[PDB]
Design a protein around this ligand. Structure first.
Ligand SMILES: NC(=O)CC[C@H](NC(=O)CCc1ccc(-c2cc(-c3ccccc3)cs2)cc1)C(=O)N[C@@H](CCC(=O)O)C(N)=O
Ligand SMILES: [Ca+2]
Ligand SMILES: [Ca+2]
Ligand SMILES: [Ca+2]
Ligand SMILES: [Zn+2]
Ligand SMILES: [Zn+2]
Length: 159
C-alpha cells in the first residue's frame, strides 16, 4: 500500500480563501468534506487556525511553487499530495475556477471530498459512481453519499 498517516488524529489549516465564496461557506464546505471520510474510518480531523497542520488547504493559480502548475480556467481543477511531512498531504485548489456552494461553476465541497481522499493516501477509482473517479461531476449535495468502492478504499488504509 502507498503512504498513510501514521496517527488517526489529523490536523488541517486553511492557508487562504477564494474570493468566489463567502469565507464561512469555504470553512463549511471544507469541514464537511473532512466529515465525509471521518464518518467511515477511525480518523479524527481537527482544524487549527494557526501553527503546524498535517494538511494545508491552498487556493492558488498557475505555477505556485510545487512543480505541478495549474492551467487556467477548466482542465485541472485541484490536486493533492499523499500522506507525508512538508507538502505531503496538502490540497491545492485552482483559483482560476469559480468555486461555489451549488451546481454552477465548480462545487468546492465535492472537489474537497475528492482531494482529501488523495490527502489520505487514496488513488483514483475505475468506478464512475466513486468520488475517486478522475473527473468532476455535480451530484445533488443534499443526498451525496460515498460509493462502496470509496469505502472499501479508505477502509483498506485505516482500520
Ligand atoms: N486533464 C485532466 O486530467 C483534468 C481532469 C479534471 N479533474 C480534476 O482536476 C480532479 C478534481 C476532481 C475529481 C473528481 C471530482 C468528483 C467526483 C464526483 C462524484 C460524486 C458522486 C458520484 C460520482 C462522482 C463529484 S465531483 C471532483 C474533482 C476535470 O474534471 N476536469 C473537468 C473539466 C471542466 C470544465 O472545463 O468545465 C472535466 N469534467 O473533465
Ligand atoms: Ca484549471
Ligand atoms: Ca503537509
Ligand atoms: Ca476563482
Ligand atoms: Zn499545487
Ligand atoms: Zn484525483
Amino acid at each position: 500500500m502507498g503512504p498513510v498517516w501514521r496517527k488517526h488524529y489529523i490536523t488541517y489549516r486553511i492557508n487562504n480563501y477564494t474570493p468566489d465564496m463567502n469565507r464561512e461557506d469555504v470553512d463549511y464546505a471544507i469541514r464537511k468534506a473532512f466529515q465525509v471520510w471521518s464518518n467511515v474510518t477511525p480518523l479524527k480531523f481537527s482544524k487549527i487556525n494557526t501553527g503546524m497542520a498535517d494538511i494545508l488547504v491552498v487556493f492558488a493559480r498557475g505555477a505556485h511553487g510545487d512543480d505541478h502548475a495549474f492551467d487556467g480556467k477548466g482542465g485541472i481543477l485541484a490536486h493533492a499530495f499523499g500522506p507525508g511531512s512538508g507538502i505531503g498531504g496538502d490540497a491545492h485548489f485552482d483559483e482560476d475556477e469559480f468555486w461555489t456552494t451549488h451546481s454552477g461553476g465548480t462545487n468546492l465541497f465535492l472537489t474537497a471530498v475528492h482531494e482529501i481522499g488523495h490527502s489520505l493516501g487514496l488513488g483514483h477509482s475505475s468506478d464512475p459512481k466513486a468520488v475517486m473517479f478522475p473527473t468532476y461531476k455535480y451530484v445533488d449535495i443534499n443526498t451525496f453519499r460515498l460509493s462502496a468502492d470509496d469505502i472499501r478504499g479508505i477502509q483498506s488504509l485505516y482500520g
